[PDB]
Design a protein around this ligand. Structure first.
Ligand SMILES: CC#Cc1cncc(-c2cccc([C@@]3(c4cc(C)c(=O)n(CC)c4)N=C(N)c4c(F)cccc43)c2)c1
Length: 375
């Protein structure tokens, strides 16, 4: 179960999710599971559904234990409902271990499962504070650390059109340059602090608390870079100005319409780079991660539109704070250092670049005239 054996253990894409193979029950039942740093339940399809190729069959598992407790989870975009239980879980291309973990067996759901996503469940990697029905339900990663010798750290190398999830350590072959750390503000979501935002080197000039209204998180279970209204509007106005040689419909900027160019002609150069400055481990020091248009213009693979390269604008408005989703994580090696309450970023081996620009992790930056950016 070495790190080299864990490399390339993920499949999928930013739009439908990145997933890892796992087994549940005895004899083991293989399932594809979405790697989700934005939730804390290990929730798996346990009943037939039109979008599921397979599902967890508890009756076939001699090791299943029923907790006699239901779980009901409505959220803005949909819902899932299920039964809580425990069973044996393993990650075949992960650590060489088997643990007993809580499993929420999904019996009913609405707009939860995605057609052609190729996953049957979700591995919620965030903390117990946000687990459903409450924080008494121990998340999977917590059970793994308690029951094995596994160091309290995992890292994600998401690669654009799979990637790697290394549990227990840092795989140096997955990144170049320096690894810059941002503190985990609170252990609920992987909450962080953005101190500055620039669009093509031009500062958005907002009070830094605006960037974190009401929180900022690192979420591998969200596709887009999601920004609070005020920040979102300034970003769009700034991107529109930088790209003014071409005019796109309002629907493109709203993320409801594709923009298409003849195959291979995408004018990358007309789109600016976005720099997100994250709080450093030292007072008023920060580092920046730079996002190229290859990251924020998400390609939409469709045989029917294939004479063209078509894209969705992968930056959208949020009313629940900033979400640094998969389009942000792609091309970075992201270390979820739970042991040291910090998140590391470095340029990935699968990073984005063209012949003019490259995604980067750079620092340090100093800001003497700073307030706390935390909301
Ligand atoms: C990259 C990527 C991705 C991706 C693409 N399509 C669907 C999903 C998805 C499907 C179902 C549920 C969730 C989702 C999620 C997962 C679980 C287990 C859960 O209990 N909830 C509700 C609290 C939400 N995980 C999130 N991080 C998230 C989010 F920020 C906003 C809405 C929904 C979610 C996410 C993820």
């Amino acid at each position: 179960g070495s790190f080299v054996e864990m490399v390339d253990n993920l499949r999928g894409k930013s739009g439908q999710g990145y997933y890892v193979e796992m087994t549940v029950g005895s004899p083991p039942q293989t399932l594809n599971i979405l790697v989700d740093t934005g939730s804390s339940n290990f929730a798996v399809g346990a009943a037939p559904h039109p979008f599921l190729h397979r599902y967890y069959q508890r009756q076939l598992s001699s090791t299943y234990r029923d907790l006699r407790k239901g779980v009901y989870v409505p959220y803005t975009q949909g819902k899932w409902e299920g039964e809580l239980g425990t069973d044996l879980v393993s990650i075949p291309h992960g650590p060489n271990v088997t643990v007993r973990a809580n499993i929420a067996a999904i019996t009913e759901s609405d707009k939860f499962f995605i057609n052609g996503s190729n996953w049957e469940g979700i591995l919620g990697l965030a903390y117990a504070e946000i687990a459903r029905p409450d924080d008494s339900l121990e998340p999977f990663f917590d059970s793994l650390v308690k029951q094995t010798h596994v160091p309290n750290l995992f890292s994600l190398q998401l690669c654009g059109a799979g990637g790697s999830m290394i549990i227990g350590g840092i795989d140096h072959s997955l990144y170049t340059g320096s690894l810059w750390y941002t503190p985990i503000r609170r252990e609920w979501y992987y909450e962080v602090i953005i101190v500055r935002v620039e669009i093509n080197g031009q500062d958005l000039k907002m009070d830094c608390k605006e960037y974190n209204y009401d929180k900022s998180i690192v979420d591998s279970g969200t596709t887009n870079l999601r920004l609070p209204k005020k920040v979102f509007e300034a970003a769009v106005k700034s991107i529109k100005a930088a790209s003014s040689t071409e005019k796109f419909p309002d629907g493109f900027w709203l993320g409801e319409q594709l923009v298409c160019w003849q195959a291979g002609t995408t004018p990358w150069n007309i789109f600016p780079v976005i720099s997100l400055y994250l709080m450093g481990e030292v007072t008023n020091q920060s580092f920046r991660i730079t996002i190229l248009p290859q990251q924020y213009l998400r390609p939409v693979e469709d045989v029917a539109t294939s004479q063209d390269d078509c894209y969705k604008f992968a930056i959208s408005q949020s009313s629940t704070g900033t979400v640094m989703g998969a389009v942000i994580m792609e091309g970075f090696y992201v270390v979820f250092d739970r042991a040291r309450k910090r998140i590391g970023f470095a340029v990935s081996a699968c990073h984005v670049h063209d012949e003019f620009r490259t995604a980067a992790v750079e620092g340090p930056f100093v800001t003497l005239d700073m307030e706390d950016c935390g909301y």
